[PDB]
Design a protein around this ligand. Structure first.
Ligand SMILES: O=C(CNC(=O)[C@@H]1CCNC1)N[C@H](c1ccc(-c2ccccc2)cc1)c1cccs1
Length: 138
């Protein structure tokens, strides 16, 4: 088993009608068929769940690349830091952002996420889709 195991991504959104989360331990190809819904203008944070198994790690980084068909990438990088080994998993949260809003903000966004570090180690890379909608349901 690897030292760092990434287990879950959660969109923390207080106004959401239900949990917005994905299991990151399964078929990664299957992850794309799953789409994740955010009402336009919602305040959210991205929460990455991960386990450290054996050794202290340093320089952890979360890298998130968002694509819309035909548009240059929208990239962000987040310092995660140093973590020691323990049975319970850790939770890193980005700062709050506001999802975009308006008719032109609606649609599906294709994300590729990297959990890595300053040693460029690929702790997990995965694609997932996000859908911005006028309301939470349709
Ligand atoms: O809308 C913007 C830029 N403007 C803002 O971000 C301000 C910030 C405050 N209010 C609006 N980018 C778009 C985007 C949309 C959604 C996300 C996303 C991903 C992951 C989770 C949640 C959401 C990421 C980016 C585009 C990406 C690609 C082409 S356009």
């Amino acid at each position: 088993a690897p030292n760092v195991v990434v287990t879950r991504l959660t969109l923390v959104c207080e106004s959401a009608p239900g949990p917005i989360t994905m299991d990151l331990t399964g078929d990664l190809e299957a992850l794309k068929k799953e789409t994740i819904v955010l009402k336009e203008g919602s305040e959210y944070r991205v929460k990455i769940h991960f386990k450290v198994n054996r050794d202290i790690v340093s320089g952890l980084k979360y890298v998130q690349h968002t694509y819309r068909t035909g548009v240059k990438v929208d990239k962000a990088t987040f310092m995660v830091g140093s973590y020691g080994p323990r049975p319970e998993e850790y939770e890193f949260l980005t700062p709050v952002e506001e999802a975009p809003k308006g008719m032109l903000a609606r649609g599906t966004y294709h994300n590729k996420s990297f959990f890595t570090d300053d040693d460029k180690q690929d702790h997990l890379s995965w694609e997932w889709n996000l859908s911005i909608k006028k309301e939470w349901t349709e």
